[PDB]
Structure formats: C-alpha cells, structure tokens
Amino acid sequence: INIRVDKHIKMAVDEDLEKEFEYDDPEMQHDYTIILEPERATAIEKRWLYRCIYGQPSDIQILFNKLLKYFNGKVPMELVIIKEEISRHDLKKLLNALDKYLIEIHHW
Amino acid sequence: PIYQHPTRLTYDIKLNPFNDWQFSTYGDDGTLAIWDRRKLSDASPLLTFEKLVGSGAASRKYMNSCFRWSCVRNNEFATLHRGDTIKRWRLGYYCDSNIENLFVSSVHDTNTMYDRVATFDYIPRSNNGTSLICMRQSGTIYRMPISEVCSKAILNNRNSLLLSNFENTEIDEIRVN
Amino acid sequence: GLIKKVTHWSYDNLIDYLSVNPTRDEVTHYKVDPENESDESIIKLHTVKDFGSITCLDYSESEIGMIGVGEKNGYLRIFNIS
Amino acid sequence: MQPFDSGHDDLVHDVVYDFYGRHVATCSSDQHIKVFKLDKDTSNWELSDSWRAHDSSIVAIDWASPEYGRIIASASYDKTVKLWEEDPDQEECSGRRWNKLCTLNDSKGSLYSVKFAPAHLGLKLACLGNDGILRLYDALEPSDLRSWTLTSEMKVLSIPPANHLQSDFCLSWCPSRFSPEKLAVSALEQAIIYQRGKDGKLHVAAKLPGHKSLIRSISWAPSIGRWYQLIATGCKDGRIRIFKITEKAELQSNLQVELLSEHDDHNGEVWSVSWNLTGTILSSAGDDGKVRLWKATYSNEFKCMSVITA
C-alpha cells in the first residue's frame, strides 16, 4: 500500500498555514503527489498525511496513525497484519474508506 | 424569434435586477459587453470592455463567475481580477433627447481578505451596505465586508469637517463645538 | 465553483445561497445573516452529493427549494433541498 | 461625529458649503438637489428644499458669491448646467423654493465639474466635461439673470475619451483679488494653470509636473497674505502633492511652480483634497477609510496631525 495526496489536501493545508488558471475548473487535472516515505517526511508532508484523515471516525484514525509508517511501498500488508495483531477486516475498512488516496501494489 | 443579432460575445447572461432591458454577456476572448434589448430590437453593444474576464469560454465548460451585477444599487457591477481585487465599476447614463447611453464614471478597487478567489457574489445589508461572499479555489467560502471610503472631505470657515461616503447616503460632520 | 444568490424563499432577514464545490460534485444550500459580519454567519444546511459533473444550476422562485442542476453527460436533475 | 441622513435614494456625489458656512448643498445620482440649513437653536442640520434638477446624475454643484444673491450651479451627466435662484416667497421642503434660471445646452459631453469665479471677476462660471472643453459663462445683462453668455472656450483634451475608459475632471479658481485671473484645470492625468492675458483670452501659463495617473481632486489654497500660492492635488496614486507657486507672451506675470511635498500615507487613491479658510489645515480622503488632516510645520513641510477612521 502506497499513500497519495491530491491537490485538495494541499489547498487545505495551505489554508491551515494561512490560519497561523483561475477562470476555469478542468475536472480532469489532479496535482497528485506520492509520499514515498511517510515516516521520513517534512512538516508540510506530515500535514498532508494527517489532513488526509480529517473526517474519518476514531477507529480509522487510530488504525491510520498506527500503520502510517508501513505505507512505504515495500512492506507487505500481510506481514503488517501478522506483526501488529490487527484484523483483516480492519485493513479492508481502512482501504475502502480511503479509496482515492491509497495505491495498491500487487507483486510477490 | 423577435430578433437575431450576430455577435460573438454570447455567454453567461445576467439581467440587471433594477432594469430588465439591460443584460451583460462576455465572450471567448474575455471581452465583456453590456447590452440593451431595445437597440437589438430596433445594433451595437452599449458598452464593451476589452479583456475584462477570463478567456477560453468555448474550450472550458466549467467557468467561474467573476462578473456580477449590483443588487444594492443601480448602474454598478463588480469584476474580480486575478483572485485578489474586486473592481466596483459605477456607470453614468445620459438620454439623447429612452435608451440610456452608458459610460464609465468611477472604478473602486477592494482588496480581498484571502487570495486565490475564483467566484464571488453580493450580500445586501441594511443602510445600503455591501458585503461580498466569495468562494476560494480550495472551496472555502467566507464573508468579506466593504469599507466605508470617504468621497469628500470639505472644511468650513468655522473649522467643520463634512464627510461623504461612497456606499451609504448619510453625511458625517465633525463640528468644532 | 458557482455561487448563485437565491431570493423569494426566506421570510426572515436571511438571504439564501447555493454553492457548487470546485470539483463539481455537490450542491450546498447556505443561509447568510447580513447584519452579522462574522464568518460564522454562514450556516451550512444541506448537501446533495450524487452528481457527476455540474455544468449549470438554476432555482425556482415560486416554489421553495426546487433546484435544477445540469450535467455534462446530459442528466438534468430537478429536486428539493429545503 | 454626528451623522445626519441626507435623504437621497442613491449615492451623494458632491457636498459644498456656502460662503457663510451655514448652508450645505448635496447633489446625488437620484436626480435631486437638497439644501440643508444649520439651525441656530437646535444646532442640527435640517432640510430647506429638495427638488428634482436634471434628467441624469448630478455630480458637481457650487454656490455663488453672496453679493450676487443665492445662486446654485448644477452640472450633471446629461450635458447641462442649470442655475438655481432662491425666491424666498415659497414654503420650505416643497420644491418651489429654488427657481430655475437658465440651462446651458452648449456642452456636447457629460459635465464633471462646475465652479464659480471669485466675486471680483464678476458672475462667471467654469464648466468641464468629457469633451475636454473648458467653457466660461458670464452674466452680462444685470436686469435678468437668465441671459448667460459663453465667452471663453479653451480645449483641454485633444480627443474625448471612449465610454469604456474612465475619466475624471476637476477645477479650482484663484481666490486672490490681488493677482490676475487664474484657473487650475485638471485633465485626465494633466494639471494646467490658465491665466487671463492682455487680449482678454485664456492662455496656457504653467503645468504641474508628475501625475502618472488620474487626478481626482484639485484645490487652490486661499491666499491669506503670503507671497506664495498653494495647489493641492489628489491623484489616483497615493500622492497628495502640494505645489508651491511663486508669481512675478501676452501674459501679465510669469509664474514658477515647485513641488513642496509628496505624501504616500493613504496607500490607495486620494479621492478628495481640500483646504481651510486660512490654508493651514488640509483634508485628504483616500481608500484606507481614513481622512487625514495636514498642517505645515515651522520648516514649511506638511505633516499629518489627525487620522479620522470611518
């Protein structure tokens, strides 16, 4: 599982940083930015990843905060389930809730 | 049909809320034009501003509204430029003697509270006040007031100051007492 | 993004508004008190989210709540909010 | 501050005092002129008359000299200047208290500013519109104040501006009975001083430098007795320029203009600039929402003293 951040989260964290072209809206353009290492990220990038969860309930927030460092595109999720003692249906819930920000990679 | 006038500035029609005979469209090159239906009925546009709004009207079907008529007073419209400033153009009219020929009298620039504004709209308040609700490019919607800018500061022989506003009707006086 | 002012609905001093998100997916009905200049005067009331790609929007003056929404595929949806 | 509602249904354009400082005339875009008198007993502004004047928006009015009677000029956008004389044998707040005298249907453009010359020059007028033509109207026949004759017609702008481009014009006479007849005329971005020559015709005398943008207000300071005159200008830029004029072909006196000060305190457009009776207090309004009061220091440098937010 690899994490992704779209332009809406970038604009949202820009608004939050403001708290402390232009004529058209082409719907086929998305400024997709992939966070390669969620553990090794800057402040704005961690802000991106934490704003990605702004709206989901408490269980999803806890499951994301405990499994954010494993979304580096190199750790299989089966080993994550085995090691962290989590339910498979919990992983299914976490994947289905964040449908448009999680990249699935399937290889041996 | 009653009339058919061939023009290329045929886009988003906003009728004037105070005079139904006047409507204003723009075009692909951003050229805004304020029309009168009686001149087309009988055919030049009543006004023509070169490159006032965003271009590319034929290519993009999702265009923000950066031009609005005024629902607080007559002969006025607001244009939003580069997501930062709103130009409140005030028009003047004269009758060649019932079609009122139009020309631009004064333009007032108001800087927005937050940058990157795509579309906006008016908020009518009491005592002829003006406030603007604006939607940013991030989708955040906020409310911004219009400040009371003094239009005339005259002094008397008794050292008395008389202040006239650009928005409301009341006149402010600071007497020497 | 489309902010359209809607009149002939509210009986109090509030002025109704209709908004479309910049991603063109939902229609939001607001309610703005003009006498209060705070940003909390905007009250979000309802949001219809089942939309593909909104291209145009219009309202009905006579009947309160009836809002038509066009789309790029060709589906015009006429519904109620209030 | 005591705000009083003028009662117009649209934007109040110009407000002018009388010579005695007890009457104010307000014009507006609702095609109305209202005259307010200052009551001696109640000390509150109360309306004297309110009558429809023009067929378009009135933008400039001026009171005449009190030794020629009570005459109010009115320049509107319908290419007319209308002169209004008070007949006191009418009821107040009726519309018949101010009688019409004459319509000046010579301007081919929408008039912007109207000004009376000082009383020592006669009952003169000065009109300016977007046609760029400065017109002076006298009152030659003393029996009836309805035969006003055009005498001086000087072209300020070569071609009129288009309708889509904005414009602004302003005028200011010379309040000096001991100096020859002068007139400060503000074009779009130009400020010209016109002087009356030996041939009886106006001529170009001096030009105020600067003014990269539109001039919104011009004002000649009263000559209290000093040897140098003062012109204050509020531009579309943030500059409140004060020009110091020292007076010494076919002109009775050549005059030199030196910029005395230049202030950027407003951070916007200086819409209006004015003077006091003695030329000591300047008042300037701008887009910051604040009206600043300027007084000259000991070293002849104008420094702000009060800021009045609104």
DSSP D38: E
Count of alpha carbons within 13 Å of B174, Cβ hemisphere only? Answer: 15
Burial class (CB in 10 A: 0-12, 13-18, 19+), B99: middle
Structure tokens at D118: 């000082």
Structure tokens at D240: 């409140």
What span, in angstroms and rounded, lies between the C-alpha atoms of A86 and D309? 63
Residue B142 in contact with partner chain A when CB distance is under 8 A: no
B140/A26 Cβ within 8 A: no
Q: Mutation test of the interface with chain B: which of C2, C10, C58, choosing the one with the most B Cβ atoms within 10 A?
A: C2
Residue A60's H or E segment, with its range, is helix A58-66
Structure tokens at D22: 């007890």
What span, in angstroms and rounded, lies between the C-alpha atoms of D86 and D84? 7
Distance from CA of A79 to the nearest CA of C (A): 37
The SS3 call for residue B26 is coil
D6/B171 Cβ within 8 A: yes
Which chains contact A through at least 3 pairs of Cβ atoms less than 8 Å apart?
B, C
Rg (CA), chain A: 15
Distance from CA of C8 to the nearest CA of B (A): 14
Structure tokens at B163: 């202040």
The shortest CB-CB distance from D4 to any of B156, B160, B171 is to B171
Which chains contact B through at least 3 pairs of Cβ atoms less than 8 Å apart?
A, C, D
- Which residues from A are below 8 Å from C1, CB to CB? 25
Q: Which residue, A92, A13, A70, A76, is CA-closest to A46?
A: A13
Give the relative orientation of helices A43-51 and A7-18 as an angle to the nearest 10 degrees: 110
State which amino acid sits at residue D199: D
Residues 6+ apart with CB under 8 A from C11: none
What span, in angstroms and rounded, lies between the C-alpha atoms of D187 and D156? 7
Rg (CA), chain B: 19
- Which residues from A are below 8 Å from C22, CB to CB? 25
- Which residues from B are below 8 Å from D16, CB to CB? 154
What span, in angstroms and rounded, lies between the C-alpha atoms of D248 and D253? 6
State which amino acid sits at residue D153: E
Distance from CA of A16 to the nearest CA of C (A): 16
Residue C71 in contact with partner chain A when CB distance is under 8 A: no
Q: Which residue, D165, D135, D257, D159, is CA-closest to D205?
A: D257
Structure tokens at D154: 């000087």
What span, in angstroms and rounded, lies between the C-alpha atoms of C25 and A27? 10
Q: Mutation test of the interface with chain B: which of A7, A8, A13, A23, choosing the one with the most B Cβ atoms within 10 A?
A: A23
The SS3 call for residue D256 is strand
DSSP A105: -
What is the residue whose two structure tokens read 């020009």?
D243
What span, in angstroms and rounded, lies between the C-alpha atoms of A28 and D251? 72
Residue C34 in contact with partner chain A when CB distance is under 8 A: no
Return the residue of B nearest to D17 by Cα: B156
C23/A27 Cβ within 8 A: yes
B122/C34 Cβ within 8 A: no
Burial class (CB in 10 A: 0-12, 13-18, 19+), D141: exposed
The shortest CB-CB distance from A22 to any of B59, B82, B140 is to B82
Q: Which residue, B128, C13, B131, is CA-closest to D6?
A: B128
DSSP A44: H
Residue C22 in contact with partner chain A when CB distance is under 8 A: yes
Return the residue of B nearest to D274 by Cα: B154
Interface of B with C in 54-113 (CB under 8 A): 61-62, 64-65, 71
State which amino acid sits at residue D296: A
Return the residue of A nearest to C53 by Cα: A27
Residues 6+ apart with CB under 8 A from C31: C10, C14, C15, C16, C17, C42, C43, C45
User: How big is the CA angle at D301 (ends D299 and D304), to the nearest 5 degrees?
Assistant: 130
The shortest CB-CB distance from B137 to any of A11, A26, A27 is to A11
Q: Which residue, A74, A69, A30, is CA-closest to A49?
A: A69
- The domains located in chain D, with CATH, are 12-247+254-310 (2.130.10.10)
Residue D171's H or E segment, with its range, is strand D170-173
B54/A24 Cβ within 8 A: yes
Q: Which residue, D86, D1, D19, is CA-closest to D277?
A: D19
Distance of CA B81 to the CA centre of its chain: 12
C22/A25 Cβ within 8 A: yes
- Which residues from D are below 8 Å from B105, CB to CB? 57, 59, 77, 166
Burial class (CB in 10 A: 0-12, 13-18, 19+), B81: middle
A23/B138 Cβ within 8 A: no
Q: Mutation test of the interface with chain C: which of B15, B143, B147, B167, choosing the one with the most C Cβ atoms within 10 A?
A: B143
DSSP C62: S
Residues 6+ apart with CB under 8 A from C33: C13, C14, C41
Q: Which residue, D121, D256, D115, is CA-closest to D181?
A: D121
Structure-determination technique: cryo-EM
What span, in angstroms and rounded, lies between the C-alpha atoms of B25 and B23? 7
Burial class (CB in 10 A: 0-12, 13-18, 19+), B93: buried
What span, in angstroms and rounded, lies between the C-alpha atoms of C3 and B132? 11
A27/C1 Cβ within 8 A: no
Residue B99 in contact with partner chain D when CB distance is under 8 A: no
- Which residues from C are below 8 Å from B131, CB to CB? 34, 37
Q: Which residue, B118, B104, B112, B115, is CA-closest to B131?
A: B112
Q: Please answer whether residues B138 and A11 qualify as being in contact, where contact means their C-beta atoms are separated by less than 8 angstroms.
A: yes
User: How big is the CA angle at D238 (ends D235 and D243), to the nearest 5 degrees?
Assistant: 55
Q: Give the 3-state secondary structure of D203-253.
A: EEEEECCCCCCCEEEEEECCCCCCCEEEEEEEECCCCEEEEEEEECCCCCC
